[model samples]
Target chain A: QVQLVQSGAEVKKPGASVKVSCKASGYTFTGYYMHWVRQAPGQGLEWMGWINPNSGGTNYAQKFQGRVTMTRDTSISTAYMELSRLRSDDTAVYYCAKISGSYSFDYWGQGTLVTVSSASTKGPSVFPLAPSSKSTSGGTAALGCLVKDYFPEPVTVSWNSGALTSGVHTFPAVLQSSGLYSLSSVVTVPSSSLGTQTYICNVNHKPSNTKVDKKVEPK
Target chain B: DIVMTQSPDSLAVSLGERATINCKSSQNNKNYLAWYQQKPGQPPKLLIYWASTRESGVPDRFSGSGSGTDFTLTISSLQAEDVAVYYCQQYYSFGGGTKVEIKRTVAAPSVFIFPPSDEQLKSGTASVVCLLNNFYPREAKVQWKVDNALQSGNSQESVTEQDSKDSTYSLSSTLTLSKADYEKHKYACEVTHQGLRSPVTKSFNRG
Candidate 1:
């Protein structure tokens, strides 16, 4: 199976520069072309440019003519894009895709989030979310995990040290007045099981590759 | 960014014949062009690129030619599987696509209206389903009506074909109503297909 794994999220101050990488495997690296695309928060995709890894030739979309650069390392099968003089408007998810046929992007990277902000880059702080009432509803208890003060908005939240699929609601990240970001997740579990159960909220801040855990138990 | 435009919005060609689509770019003159084939309810597939180079694994009959601001995508001997829309795109811009179909105009679908099941009617809620099958080209206007009054808020899903051999489309729509409305109102499913001279309607009522 062909794959394109990109670098993790990044937090960059406005006017700074950032380089993101995409590593390809499971296929001939130079057999196809690679293209870069940008998608702002809740916006459609915008074409950035494409590169011919075999010849080291590249073409940048007219809109991105001189604002960005694309490079690749055939020895490592890795592609890189560097953007300079970043602005808040440049805060978007950048994806590296392998072109299939003539134009379609058949395979894509997981996407690297480049956040351009004026706030200083910082890791996240994790804590318990306050309950609206007693945190008990019917036969279940609602456990809220709050992660805040993160410079980059993209953070991973998990329950009991494992990724949860059901009975979990993760709210979108909210920008704070202090220029940091905040997000919360709530999980519903059986109330009677709380006494014997130890639920841990694991917060993974990708920008810093730091993991923080907060324990929740019956009081 | 440059603007890309394609000509001949729709084409009617016979099998074993040739079909062509042209794309013009407003600015720049390079071989940064690509062509795609898109089927209804399916993602676009790349066919040609680099002005005249065919993508690997694509059939030899599908060729691309031209340079500068003008480019063409051609199907040397159109195949049954090649009945779809084709789009031309410049690296700088994307444009509207062109539709290609067999000389045969259209295939009308068979429609059926089903009333709420006994289990649903027992729960004081009802749902009516409209089923359409065997349509060709996959474009139709489906609407729901209550006692000759136009109704909205119905859900219609994308048309699908069983397989490539089937070569026909099937679609479905659903409408929900309270028990009171289901018992006292007359519901109808009306469909207008490209091949139809007018519209076809099926009605349901329960005393």
Candidate 2:
């Protein structure tokens, strides 16, 4: 099993530069390329780009054009990203993933949370969310799960419902101050198929990954 | 950069049933595309890449097919754990996402309270919170009768699929009055849901 282990989270001030690390083991490092992904606070996944360990070749998403530098150390089977001039917008969870012949990130390192804050909460105030639904004119419905706020890094979010149930979820990296630190995941199902009592949100507390569950029950 | 367009805002399926989701790219990049599963609050996981090839360790039941611009992800015998948002990423661009859900037992919400903590009451104004916790249907609304008035921007709200540990939809509005305004007139948190008749109202006393 190939494993990509990430560095712990970091809290840096605005305008500071931060270097995050991802180490891959269990497989030949040069055999695959590593790509970086950025998940901004309260948003979906965003691609930053990738680095080829064998040749140091790089390809970046336009959004990360000037803000990030991707490099790797072949000797240690590790990939590195240097984010410069950090802004509140740069406050997110970054994952280093392995790119293979297929169109997928074959493996991933745990997320490295980088928050740009002066003072904020110390640990994760992980909140489990309930399933929310949205219906489209097309007859399809979106069942959503939301996980709110930031405090510490490396925490994970999961899903456990769609009325049926066991998955996971969580949100952007970096500490928030009475501000944005949230996540919403929706499962689109047919209206007739929508059921009940299955929506559950799981917030995996950092370090230990102990899970706290929020279940939908009777009033 | 190729664009990836995903369809169907959401879905609900039953266990052991087959669930199919699609992702279309703007240009043909061969099988240079991938599918991911995002369980809320957590990072997205890669299921298939390069068109139909499943990533190592991906469940055998989850499979991908299609080439160039149009692609599909099919989960055979959908399991409870498979409930999550599915997304596709082109070699150059990434698709938005398509949510796939399944049916379960029906449950209802219990209480919505603004637990008085250190932050709920401070000084210059306060959080008029409606902590609608322990809820089902995640879809609920909070209307504030400020001096007795409302808007959708105000009430009968649109529950943007965000977080709620049980859709604990704690929606609140701002109150401008001071300790004096907390009384100057009045305000109320009226919850409206198709699931419940006679909306639940938690009124703020004109104290």
Candidate 3:
């Protein structure tokens, strides 16, 4: 029954500041530690920091140390986070989590959406994943590509040098806690040719008009 | 790709005894290993995930503990009904699995189909008998077939009996047919056992 209810969405202009609130209920505030996490619209979980409500001691993640401040008002059972000099990269859904003993985070706030407008666009960083032969079937092997830290969200990924009739899966861009977008794609190739064949991952970032290619060879 | 391998191809434990199984991944899995229990003729059930977290509704008697490449699944005390194959799966691949039995070496079942007796054939009623012989651990699936089609409604299955000497199990199924039908069709008894890689089948016909 523990709950951490977060504040509503906020739209802000670049270079402004924002304060988010998380209200705790259904449990005593001092008994647990409160932590913060960020997730961009299409990104995975990113830890921001945590605060001990009883002592008011706080620790911020290396990425957020300069501009992030976490505090609590135990008298009202509320936790707060303030961010300064906000940029487009600071747009994300921030969540407050409660650490429950050794099992880790057991309860979490719904989330607060912060959108920073008129931000600068950035290109993606591309990398090739190591090729591996699939265990379930020997007839084919797999290769993957990762595209991270891109802005404007829309990107195109394709492969070269293989027919890829099936088993091509692309994970859509997810917002990262750092306010950037990342995605991954995996494709299958014939096992017999995997050892000697070469493949290329081509990524097209339209916002910045950036094109990147990562090459991989199976050993 | 990460390959998963489980140790101890087979296990035999006394009632109320503790049983331990290990799953080792070829590479560090970041604690993405999972444990599953598969009963004969049933789908696999998830027991633990994230290496040590038990799925809801699973009893505490089954616990998982470990990280990275090495992981363990321990049953506090083996129960009578816990006899089944245990499998360990990783984020990328699955282990070969380990079979657990109760204080005895498992045995594969043998199947045989007996033709109708002469007196019954002469009397216009044909009864074919299928025998399942000496399988241990006591789980099997048996079916009767005629010309590749399954038989039902007119088949009787005997109570599975345990042999006094070997503690193995045996059962028989009788499929009754008309004399004319028996002469015109080929019959088969098919059995599926955990020990065998494929189903055991035996055929019988007038020819």
Candidate 4:
């Protein structure tokens, strides 16, 4: 199963600062972008911003223009979102989201709750989850998982579940609206194993964490 | 900042039914409205854009309607998978200062049939439970009254351990009516919270 574990709850005081972490496992960290969101105590969810782990580029939701900053460490498959000058209105849950397309998150971390009170709370701020990977022959395979805000970059889709034969391979995008996140992915399986095997979407997020597969059963 | 509001706070639907999301804009934007869904750990996904156009590959059963400042996202046929918190976003402003507003409708009050208790049979009693459906921040309260007299022991409340769909605090309160006192009583559910037009109430009868 593909999972995104998030950091623990945080408490902060007005005018203080805080940072949250989302560590990716079971897949390649560089293959996708990590997005962040904010949900105030009694308000709606806001798009804080997103980080490109590969290039270090960032985009903000305008509302989060100066209040928040995002960065990532690809080597360790970890993504960071930091907020400064916290206010009572800034008290809400912060989420590390994964996007797969231009603007859609198909998967997500469990979420980290940050409460802004009077004092600031600090800790490791990193949460980890496991993702699985596999492959099939000539069949649609899962290359990677996409979250609502994060988009998956071009990456190699390998066959880890079925027989592999040297041949042309093609993977089309599958789109669907999850209760929360929406997903779309491309997978390639060897033609010879077409209809005879399966493929997996794997990522190398952490060392020795290679080959984490999120199964893709092509119809 | 673009503010969006949904009326009725929460709602409930039968299987294979339809649910509507009404989005009202604070300021006039020609057509800059989007709807998204938020689940437990996942981020919200865009379902409708420009007020009506469905996102690429989205199911036809899910459609967007309305125009101008007021827009609606309608799911023609509700699926179990569709049960989640839905929000509206207004992106007319290109600047980073734009704000999105969301309003949740309350779900229809549930009809709870309570088992006949020994005291109920002797006193010719009946009991009904009304669960508050759709309010966020979990701070709403439920009050009960029988024969227009405020009844204190007929109410119970519980806050959801899990966060709100928007990752905020969410809670629901239950109002219970005993068989003997509920025979000819009137029940009402009222919600008091911030960012709402006014205190809203729903009233029903018990036989």
Q: Which candidate is the best by TM-score?
A: 2
What DockQ class does candidate 1 belong to? incorrect
- Tens-place lDDT per residue, model 3, B152-199, is 776655533234345566555667677998888857888888877899
Between which residue pairs do clashes occur in model 1?
A: none
- For model 3, residues A159-192, the per-residue Cα lDDT tens digits are 7733442444455555554566666655656768
lDDT of 1 by residue, A1-219 (tens): 888998987878888998989999998999888888766764435678888889879989877788889999999999988888899899988889788654556567878888888887678766554222244545766565656568776688888777554455455566665787766555667778777767788888867677888775543
**Against the true structure, what is model 1's DockQ?**
0.03
| C-alpha positional error of residue A48 in candidate 3 after TM-score superposition, expressed in Å | 0.5
> DockQ of candidates 1 onward, in order?
0.03, 0.14, 0.01, 0.04
lDDT of each: 0.72, 0.61, 0.70, 0.51
Q: 1 or 3: which has the higher TM-score?
A: 1
**Highest lDDT among the candidates is held by which one?**
1
- Cα lDDT tens digits for candidate 2, A1-219: 778998988878788888999999999998888999877655557888889899999988877788789999999988999888888778788889887766467677778888776545443333222222212214433333333344444445455623333222222332234553433333333445445435555556564344556543211
Which pairs in model 3 have colliding backbones?
Answer: A42-A174, A42-A175, A43-A174, A43-A175
Model 3 scores a C-alpha lDDT of 0.70
Q: Tens-digit lDDT track for model 1 on B49-145?
A: 7878877789999999998889999998887789877877775365577877665447886565556555556767565656555567667888999
Ranking by DockQ: 2, 4, 1, 3
The candidate 1 chain B region of ten consecutive residues with least summed lDDT is B155-164
